[PDB]
Ligand binder design. Sequence first.
Ligand SMILES: [Mg+2]
Lengths: 49, 115, 115, 98, 48
Amino acid sequence: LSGGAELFMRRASLKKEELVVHPANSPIANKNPDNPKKTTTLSYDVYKD
Amino acid sequence: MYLVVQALIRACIIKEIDLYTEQLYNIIKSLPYDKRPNVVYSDQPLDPNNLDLSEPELWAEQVGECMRYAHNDQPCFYIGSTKRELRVNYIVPVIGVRDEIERVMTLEEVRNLHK
Amino acid sequence: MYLVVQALIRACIIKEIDLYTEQLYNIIKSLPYDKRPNVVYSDQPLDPNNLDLSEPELWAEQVGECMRYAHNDQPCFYIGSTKRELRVNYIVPVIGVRDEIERVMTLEEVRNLHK
Amino acid sequence: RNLLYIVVVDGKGNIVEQYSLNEIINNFNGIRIKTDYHSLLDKKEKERFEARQNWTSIENIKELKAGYISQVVHKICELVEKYDAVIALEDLNSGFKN
Amino acid sequence: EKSLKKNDAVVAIMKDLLDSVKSFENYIKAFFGEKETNRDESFYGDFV
RNA sequence: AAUUUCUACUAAGUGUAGAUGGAAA
Ligand SMILES: [Mg+2]
């Protein structure tokens, strides 16, 4: 451990009125065609960014 | 007088376009990404009946992942690849190639687009 | 006179209820049949804001498979088990047990109902 | 027609192994899923072709490529360990790419 | 009218403009000969 | 489309595969 670490903070750059999210149980699609399973249904939320 | 009606029918149009989008984004949410149709994005509601396609300020790209907002449940879309960050709210399908748009694609054809 | 507006706002209400149903039937279409919420069926549109729950002509059963019509795309529902053939068009969730309805369940709770 | 093509020869001039790298094959949990990277690039290019300004649709591609030469580094530091070989790279100072 | 980032007409036009201008600047830049003997200083003066 | 961060994702469900040297200018 070459000493001299640091600690940064960065504010939330997105306004909470802008967030986008695949809702729960909504069967999402999958982009890569070679993948055989052509959908997906998570039981929670996928908050983009 | 006559400027409370024609300032209210312009809420019937919004409340119909919201239904149209809600009815579309639930069928763009199924097609595999390589078939979704060429759309005419814009950030203000679009009446997909007339749309005056000879307008000069509307392109026709392919529509990427159709997500859904966080606070309300407005169905926001995504044009082209995602990382362009072209988050547009209302769309309307067109059989139009990039700019020389030909006509507006009816709904049932967008649904029948899966095949 | 005043009987073309109050014969038009009663189309804004219909065009809002269609959107509400379109927005619900796309989340009843996911819950497993043993969790779908107790609804208040009826064949005429229901404003889920007021609904005057003290009305005497509306029950509260559990909602079965939420199908979708053939010619248009109206989202018809099905109350209780299917073979009752109780095809109702508009619904609205309620936390109400069979008849002593308590309140109307907000949308996000119906979505949050999956768990 | 290939983003990067690999052949590895013996001390005598036999093609020991040859293949293309249009299909980086992620190898997870025993079951392998291949993910193309040329079809992906062709789609993004056809997207640039109808984007009307391509200042942001020309950064996405310069990032995808630089995100594809960070998943071929592994398919190369795999061969090197597997064969204890040397690597042959075109020297760009004297090339005319068509 | 819109957010400049999403907007295009105020970026597509910007590009059509800056691209042509910068192409001209890139094309005329050649006329230096990089540090020589006599040249038409009457030309190179206004040129530079 | 979830990431110290980037890219491609959904990869068996709050994540999978690679890569990553940051702070200054
Ligand atoms: Mg990404």
